[PDB]
């Protein structure tokens, strides 16, 4: 899913530079598919990548529903980190939680 | 080697904060000095991130300026890796950790 996540990041940047919201629509379709695979495989690193792009979207638009989705995925990430006993992923999750709130 | 030492450093900071024994913070910073140098040579961004996370924890519990100075030096090294690799996700994780450093008292 490396190709899709990098393309999604690219489209988020192009959408903000051009104002073409159809590109943000496409980016979000890519992000949904990556999120679905991350959640189905319990992959915290993929989730972190999705969350990072969602935060970018929230900075650019202030969309509360995108913020809500990012918070949803952060809870899922913290669940995986606690399940696996990885305190560092847990701390990253908390550092990203701060970034969501400051982006609103 | 490095991962074990990192886990021990994190453990010692938790033990220091649990007991109030600041000599364990000292030992953790010693371990982190050694690992920070190893992880910089490995080029492994995860290991750098783990070390920075523990340094942030120590700054909050002690305020030690030299600990914060090391965290900033490693955040610079982490950003160089991100640039070299074209990895915007490492860049974003570095920025998120830098916000935490800049908000310590
Ligand atoms: C991001 C942050 C911390 C981490 N610890 C192990 C993997 C990993 C990824």
Numbering used by the authors:
A (entry chain B): 1 to 104
B (entry chain A): 0 to 104
From the manuscript:
We reasoned that to enable systematic design of binders to convex protein target sites it would be necessary to generate scaffold sets with overall concave shapes. We focused on 5 helix bundle scaffolds with three helices forming the concave interface and two helices providing structural support. The selected 7476 scaffolds, which we refer to as 5HCS (5 helix concave scaffolds) throughout the remainder of the text, have a wide range of curvatures. Our method for computationally designing small but concave proteins to bind to convex protein target sites expands the space of the protein surfaces that can be targeted by de novo protein design.
Programmed death-ligand 1 (PD-L1), is upregulated on many tumors, and interacts with PD-1 on T-cells to downregulate T-cell activation. We optimized the stronger binder, 5HCS_PDL1_0, by resampling the residues at the designed interface using ProteinMPNN15 followed by Alphafold28 filtering. The highest affinity binder, 5HCS_PDL1_1, which has 93.2% similarity with the sequence of 5HCS_PDL1_0, is expressed at high levels, very stable and has an affinity of 646 pM. We solved the high resolution crystal structure of 5HCS_PDL1_1. The refined structure has excellent geometry and reveals the expected helical assembly with five antiparallel helices. The crystal structure of 5HCS_PDL1_1 superimposes on the computational design model with a rmsd of 0.75 Å over 105 aligned Cα atoms (the substitutions which increase affinity relative to 5HCS_PDL1_0 do not alter the backbone structure). As with 5HCS_TGFBR2_1 and 5HCS_CTLA4_1, the interfacial helices H1, H3 and H5 of 5HCS_PDL1_1 have an overall concave shape. The key interactions between H1 and PD-L1 include aromatic packing of Y9 and Y123 on PD-L1 and electrostatic interactions between D10 and E13 with K124 and R125 on PD-L1. H3 binds to the hydrophobic pocket formed by Y56, M115, A121 and Y123. Residues Y9, E13, K56 and Q99 spanning the three helices satisfy the hydrogen bonding requirements of both the side chains and backbone of the PD-L1 edge beta strand (A121-R125) buried at the interface.
